[PDB]
Amino acid sequence: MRKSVIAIIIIVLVVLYMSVFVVKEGERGITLRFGKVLRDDDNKPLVYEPGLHFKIPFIETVKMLDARIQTMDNQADRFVTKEKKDLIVDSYIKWRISDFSRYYLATGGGDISQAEVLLKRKFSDRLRSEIGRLDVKDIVTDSRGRLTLEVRDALNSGSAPVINPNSMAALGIEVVDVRIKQINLPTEVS
Amino acid sequence: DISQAEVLLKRKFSDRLRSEIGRLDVKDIVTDSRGRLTLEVRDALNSGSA
Amino acid sequence: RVVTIAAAAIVIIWAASGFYTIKEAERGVVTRFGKFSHLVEPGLNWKPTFIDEVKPVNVEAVRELAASGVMLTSDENVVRVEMNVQYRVTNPEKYLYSVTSPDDSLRQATDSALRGVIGKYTMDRILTEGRTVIRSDTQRELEETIRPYDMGITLLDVNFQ
Amino acid sequence: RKVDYSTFLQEVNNDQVREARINGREINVTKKDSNRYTTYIPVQDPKLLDNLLTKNVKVVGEP
Amino acid sequence: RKVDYSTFLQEVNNDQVREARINGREINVTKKDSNRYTTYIPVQDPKLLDNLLTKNVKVVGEP
Amino acid sequence: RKVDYSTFLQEVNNDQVREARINGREINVTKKDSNRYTTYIPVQDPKLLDNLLTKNVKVVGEP
Amino acid sequence: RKVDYSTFLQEVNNDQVREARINGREINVTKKDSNRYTTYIPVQDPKLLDNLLTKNVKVVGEP
Amino acid sequence: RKVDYSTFLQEVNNDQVREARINGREINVTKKDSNRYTTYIPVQDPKLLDNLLTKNVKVVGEP
Amino acid sequence: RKVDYSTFLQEVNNDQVREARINGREINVTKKDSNRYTTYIPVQDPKLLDNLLTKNVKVVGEP
């Protein structure tokens, strides 16, 4: 009767509500099934661009990957210049997810923490490789024209459609800008 | 919006006044202004005078 | 007769919840299920409830940022320097989707540009003839740094403090 | 948005606040970058208005 | 007209108000140039009355 | 006859008041020449009684 | 028999009463010569307790 | 049993109270010798709470 | 749980409380070791808010 009709319509409505999928313009998110979302669509998993989508209620779980530039700041660091004088560099790096599938697969998890620590390690390694050849006066004078652009280009290319495994392009991340906020001296020199 | 025009006016007038007051000393700008520095600033703003 | 009254009630609630207001100074970005529907002018407006969402953004207002620091000069000298940066939001989709938290990004870019410009000049030259040249070069460096990020922010003015 | 009172204070002393409107216990706080957040007063503070005024912060009453 | 409390205090400190009728929180300010407006006290300000009397400003209560 | 608060404090400091009949906010004021009027306390004042007792004027209350 | 608040203050300033039974606004006062009366506080007076405590005048509250 | 406020403050300065349960207008007090009594604030005194805190005297509020 | 006010005072002096949520009369204290308890104010203490601020203790109001 009408009670059964009401029950069935409300049940299909709540099923639709549980199965509705929404993706915001800012971020691109792919479904997280326990077993199979990895290696979907042969090698490259689905991207799931923003828009309406349909999902199985319980076989998978919602999760989102951000799709705009992020900033990672190194609060403090210690570097040795050519003349063996310690320097403290506080710098921020801006990174954008280039390819989402490779970003998800290469990083241990979808969380940005793993990619952030990988980027921090590689950037710090390259920075300590580069700054060691220079002197503190040259560092404080024209760093942007001799350190930041060169570090960014090297980190993108990977020196020292061919992709170097050493390069960050192998990871889904891409570096868009590197700047040096603050430079400090050891307390003795200060 | 008024704000952009006000900011541009602030910048141009501040630069012109800084130049003019750097040209003069304290006595000339304190004792006898007589609308000389101010008139110069005004008619330098209304024209392309530098 | 019950179904017709129910339909009338639900469409009335639909229309009633559809209306919303946007302040005169602000603009809006409306997205239907996250597809960036369009740009919305201030006033009273209508949208399909539970379908599209509107995000308001302050465009008319002018925003100011203060950047201060102990900074190293060319002649192995440290100086405390303060600046104020005035900027305003344009093309709000860029301000909303290009960079997370554009204000913090602009603050960091301002600090970096300030360091870059102050590194070139010596202490006494700053302390005496700073305002003009330091402000001009700082503004140029800051706009050059902001440009690649392609945020909606337009740099209204930078002034020495 | 709800923000607690302490960080509102060290934002005031670090002059990131531009306009504060106090209808009752609550304060409608606007930052210099035109971001607004509500704050709740835990208990009446005689030094609050003095600190707000000395930092050249715009203060608005309510009907 | 409504004028903000901080602006009113800046006005009285600059010798621009003449008489102030205080009705609880509400204050009816009359400037020296015969312009009248209304302001509201945000929170209990002990310094307000002292500032008003110090600057030779007429103060009038109401029933 | 109603007299404002500021002039009443001026009279108190100039010593032309004998006794003050305080009834809540209202103050029924009698001058030293037995002149009667009424003044109003606009906002809670923390120092009026200090000056009143300093000038040695008979202050009374009302049930 | 009711006594002025001011007169109460110069009387206790002379060390002449012993007990002060404080009942809200009204106070039951007994002098050193066993004379009892009632006095009324015009407004809230913070210095009252300090003056009464300093001069060894006993105070008692009421339920 | 009720104990006079002047005697209470003197006894607190004597460091002989251990706990004081304050009920707004009321106070429930325990001496160091396990003697229980009850006293009253005549009028609000922050110096009371200051004296109890500096004397390391337990203070107890209740819902 | 419940904790004495003086206990809270000496506790915040030694810097091991983190979050203090003020709901009018009541206080919900959060310790540095994730311990939560409840405290009550004896009487209005102006020094409380200042003391909590100077020791970098988060303070959160409630509607």
Side-chain angles (χ1 to χ4, degrees):
Chain A
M1 72 291 291
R2 310 153 195 167
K3 325 168 191 176
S4 177
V5 169
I6 286 187
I8 194 167
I9 65 182
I10 68 173
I11 207 61
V12 303
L13 262 68
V14 294
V15 161
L16 188 153
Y17 200 49
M18 186 66 204
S19 293
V20 70
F21 205 51
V22 62
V23 178
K24 304 177 179 179
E25 177 66 28
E27 68 269 15
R28 281 76 177 272
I30 72 182
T31 56
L32 183 63
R33 177 196 292 186
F34 305 95
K36 194 46 188 180
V37 295
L38 60 94
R39 196 201 163 269
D40 278 342
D41 189 14
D42 292 331
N43 56 6
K44 174 213 72 74
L46 273 300
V47 189
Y48 292 166
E49 302 202 25
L52 280 181
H53 294 277
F54 293 99
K55 67 180 180 181
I56 308 179
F58 291 166
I59 201 65
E60 68 90 20
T61 306
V62 63
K63 64 93 181 183
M64 295 296 172
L65 309 187
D66 179 319
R68 45 189 183 177
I69 317 186
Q70 294 82 17
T71 65
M72 183 278 288
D73 295 20
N74 292 318
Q75 175 62 23
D77 278 316
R78 195 65 153 259
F79 289 92
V80 174
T81 190
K82 174 164 56 184
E83 68 188 354
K84 312 171 302 174
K85 296 185 176 52
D86 291 331
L87 207 59
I88 292 184
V89 182
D90 188 342
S91 55
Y92 80 93
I93 187 168
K94 281 175 164 293
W95 47 290
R96 208 185 71 253
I97 281 174
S98 178
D99 181 31
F100 293 78
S101 46
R102 297 184 58 187
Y103 160 82
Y104 194 20
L105 264 55
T107 62
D111 56 344
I112 62 170
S113 88
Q114 163 54 350
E116 270 186 345
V117 307
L118 293 173
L119 187 80
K120 177 176 171 65
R121 185 180 67 191
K122 275 218 188 161
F123 158 71
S124 68
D125 180 20
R126 181 66 178 171
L127 187 50
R128 96 184 187 190
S129 162
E130 180 68 26
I131 198 170
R133 313 156 167 167
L134 278 299
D135 61 82
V136 56
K137 188 152 263 163
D138 197 358
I139 301 299
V140 72
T141 287
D142 198 345
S143 50
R144 73 162 215 168
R146 295 203 42 66
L147 268 48
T148 80
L149 196 147
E150 316 299 327
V151 172
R152 188 263 304 279
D153 294 7
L155 190 59
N156 288 353
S157 47
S159 57
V162 60
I163 46 165
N164 189 359
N166 181 346
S167 179
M168 271 275 148
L171 183 62
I173 301 299
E174 166 195 14
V175 174
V176 66
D177 205 7
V178 164
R179 323 294 295 184
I180 296 194
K181 315 198 250 173
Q182 184 178 2
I183 291 192
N184 290 338
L185 274 296
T187 175
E188 298 86 340
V189 187
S190 83
Chain B
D1 202 358
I2 176 173
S3 187
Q4 193 283 359
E6 211 168 39
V7 171
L8 184 58
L9 193 87
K10 183 184 289 294
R11 184 62 38 202
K12 190 158 177 50
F13 160 76
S14 163
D15 298 4
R16 165 67 46 190
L17 178 57
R18 181 172 320 281
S19 177
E20 293 294 329
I21 201 166
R23 284 291 320 310
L24 305 192
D25 53 33
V26 66
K27 177 170 182 307
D28 294 318
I29 67 171
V30 160
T31 62
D32 180 66
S33 173
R34 205 176 194 279
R36 180 177 292 171
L37 183 147
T38 65
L39 187 146
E40 187 67 6
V41 166
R42 158 162 68 90
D43 76 333
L45 283 192
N46 273 353
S47 56
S49 305
Chain C
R1 275 182 287 172
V2 173
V3 293
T4 316
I5 300 299
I10 63 170
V11 303
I12 284 307
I13 299 304
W14 183 258
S17 277
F19 294 105
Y20 64 92
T21 181
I22 280 178
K23 294 189 51 74
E24 161 75 37
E26 318 175 8
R27 300 281 294 276
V29 174
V30 60
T31 72
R32 183 143 24 90
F33 63 92
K35 261 201 174 179
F36 176 59
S37 300
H38 45 285
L39 211 56
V40 172
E41 292 292 351
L44 58 92
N45 283 319
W46 195 82
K47 69 180 179 68
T49 300
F50 294 141
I51 298 195
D52 59 356
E53 281 83 2
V54 60
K55 193 64 191 61
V57 56
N58 205 345
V59 176
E60 206 75 5
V62 169
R63 317 189 182 197
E64 183 190 51
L65 188 152
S68 179
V70 169
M71 322 276 308
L72 199 63
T73 65
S74 177
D75 293 7
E76 61 188 337
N77 290 331
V78 298
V79 297
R80 259 286 314 266
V81 175
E82 288 155 284
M83 301 275 168
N84 291 44
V85 169
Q86 311 209 264
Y87 62 93
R88 67 186 318 176
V89 187
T90 64
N91 42 64
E93 63 273 16
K94 300 289 183 68
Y95 169 85
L96 262 170
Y97 305 128
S98 192
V99 159
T100 77
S101 69
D103 294 297
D104 181 76
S105 69
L106 189 139
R107 161 145 43 207
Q108 298 181 340
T110 300
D111 204 351
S112 178
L114 199 156
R115 207 284 316 178
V117 62
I118 193 165
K120 294 185 285 186
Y121 299 95
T122 175
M123 183 177 176
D124 56 356
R125 198 149 180 254
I126 291 168
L127 264 293
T128 72
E129 192 271 330
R131 331 199 78 92
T132 61
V133 58
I134 302 304
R135 164 265 171 184
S136 171
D137 281 354
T138 296
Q139 189 191 21
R140 188 155 39 83
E141 299 298 320
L142 174 59
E143 61 164 342
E144 287 184 355
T145 290
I146 289 304
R147 187 193 322 297
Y149 308 156
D150 195 7
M151 301 166 318
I153 291 168
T154 65
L155 184 63
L156 193 60
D157 171 83
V158 178
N159 46 3
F160 201 105
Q161 190 165 309
Chain D
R1 164 163 193 207
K2 204 82 51 183
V3 175
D4 63 358
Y5 174 110
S6 194
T7 190
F8 157 74
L9 271 183
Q10 70 274 16
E11 261 166 20
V12 161
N13 310 60
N14 185 7
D15 63 358
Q16 303 164 210
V17 176
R18 149 157 293 160
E19 156 173 339
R21 314 166 51 92
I22 312 176
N23 189 359
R25 294 161 321 111
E26 61 76 10
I27 304 157
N28 292 113
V29 179
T30 301
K31 279 178 35 201
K32 299 298 293 295
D33 72 39
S34 74
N35 192 37
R36 54 161 41 71
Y37 55 90
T38 302
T39 303
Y40 292 165
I41 279 173
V43 67
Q44 63 84 30
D45 187 7
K47 266 301 290 203
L48 163 59
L49 188 153
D50 291 331
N51 174 357
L52 264 174
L53 288 203
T54 61
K55 300 300 290 183
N56 189 359
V57 176
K58 166 84 139 53
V59 183
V60 162
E62 296 280 8
Chain E
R1 197 147 89 89
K2 264 62 151 193
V3 168
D4 291 331
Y5 177 80
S6 89
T7 295
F8 156 68
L9 282 193
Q10 299 203 0
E11 269 200 330
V12 62
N13 283 119
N14 293 14
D15 291 331
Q16 296 189 34
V17 308
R18 181 179 62 83
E19 71 96 20
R21 273 210 279 92
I22 313 191
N23 171 21
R25 274 204 320 140
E26 197 196 311
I27 290 179
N28 288 41
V29 186
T30 305
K31 291 174 70 175
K32 276 193 215 274
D33 63 358
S34 80
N35 292 124
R36 323 190 309 160
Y37 60 80
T38 313
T39 177
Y40 301 93
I41 307 184
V43 307
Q44 193 213 310
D45 193 4
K47 326 280 285 205
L48 181 159
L49 183 63
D50 291 331
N51 197 349
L52 275 177
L53 277 296
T54 293
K55 278 294 183 313
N56 290 318
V57 175
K58 194 176 183 183
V59 183
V60 172
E62 293 179 353
Chain F
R1 168 150 177 83
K2 314 193 91 203
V3 176
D4 73 38
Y5 187 85
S6 77
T7 62
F8 160 70
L9 276 296
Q10 193 34 40
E11 301 206 290
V12 167
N13 270 31
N14 190 359
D15 273 308
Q16 293 82 17
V17 65
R18 171 171 65 245
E19 67 90 21
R21 292 179 65 251
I22 291 171
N23 174 347
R25 304 200 326 273
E26 293 83 3
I27 308 189
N28 307 271
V29 176
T30 51
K31 291 177 71 68
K32 277 185 174 170
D33 63 358
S34 179
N35 288 24
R36 293 219 331 278
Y37 55 84
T38 48
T39 65
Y40 264 52
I41 297 169
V43 57
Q44 188 274 331
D45 184 316
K47 55 142 181 193
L48 73 165
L49 61 83
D50 293 348
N51 290 318
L52 278 194
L53 311 175
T54 297
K55 294 310 170 302
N56 285 68
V57 297
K58 274 152 31 193
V59 298
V60 298
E62 298 297 330
Chain G
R1 186 267 182 275
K2 264 82 171 163
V3 168
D4 294 28
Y5 181 101
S6 88
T7 59
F8 181 76
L9 276 296
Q10 70 274 16
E11 191 69 26
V12 302
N13 184 357
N14 290 318
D15 291 330
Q16 189 274 331
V17 309
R18 54 221 191 211
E19 72 86 11
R21 180 177 175 87
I22 278 165
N23 206 305
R25 324 203 292 111
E26 69 275 16
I27 298 194
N28 267 351
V29 176
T30 298
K31 325 193 171 43
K32 278 189 179 178
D33 56 11
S34 78
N35 269 35
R36 184 141 71 270
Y37 62 86
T38 62
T39 178
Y40 281 32
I41 62 170
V43 296
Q44 311 333 290
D45 195 2
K47 74 182 301 153
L48 188 153
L49 290 194
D50 183 57
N51 192 2
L52 171 153
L53 188 153
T54 300
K55 301 181 77 68
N56 286 45
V57 176
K58 175 282 291 183
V59 65
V60 65
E62 171 275 359
Chain H
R1 174 191 141 160
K2 282 164 304 173
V3 168
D4 271 21
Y5 183 108
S6 85
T7 61
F8 181 76
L9 62 83
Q10 193 39 46
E11 170 186 300
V12 170
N13 296 115
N14 189 359
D15 208 28
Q16 189 274 331
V17 185
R18 65 179 177 88
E19 185 183 2
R21 287 212 295 96
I22 297 169
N23 171 25
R25 180 66 178 86
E26 191 66 289
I27 309 95
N28 264 317
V29 176
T30 64
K31 292 181 181 179
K32 277 190 177 178
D33 45 42
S34 80
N35 292 337
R36 187 88 164 129
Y37 63 82
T38 314
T39 184
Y40 273 126
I41 308 85
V43 57
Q44 173 187 342
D45 204 332
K47 186 191 81 212
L48 187 153
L49 188 153
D50 203 338
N51 284 347
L52 281 71
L53 62 83
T54 184
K55 253 83 181 163
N56 204 7
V57 163
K58 300 289 94 175
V59 291
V60 176
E62 63 273 20
Chain I
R1 314 181 61 280
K2 214 193 191 213
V3 165
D4 291 331
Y5 181 76
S6 66
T7 300
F8 181 76
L9 294 175
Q10 53 75 10
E11 193 155 33
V12 65
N13 296 115
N14 296 115
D15 291 331
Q16 63 282 10
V17 301
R18 184 191 332 115
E19 192 285 300
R21 164 181 310 81
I22 301 299
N23 210 310
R25 274 301 310 111
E26 183 178 1
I27 292 184
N28 290 318
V29 189
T30 302
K31 285 302 301 323
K32 276 192 176 178
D33 62 355
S34 78
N35 191 359
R36 304 151 61 270
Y37 61 83
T38 296
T39 301
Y40 264 61
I41 297 89
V43 65
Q44 313 334 290
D45 194 2
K47 165 192 101 173
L48 187 153
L49 188 153
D50 177 328
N51 189 359
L52 271 63
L53 290 163
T54 61
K55 304 253 201 173
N56 189 359
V57 176
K58 178 154 302 313
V59 184
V60 177
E62 291 295 41

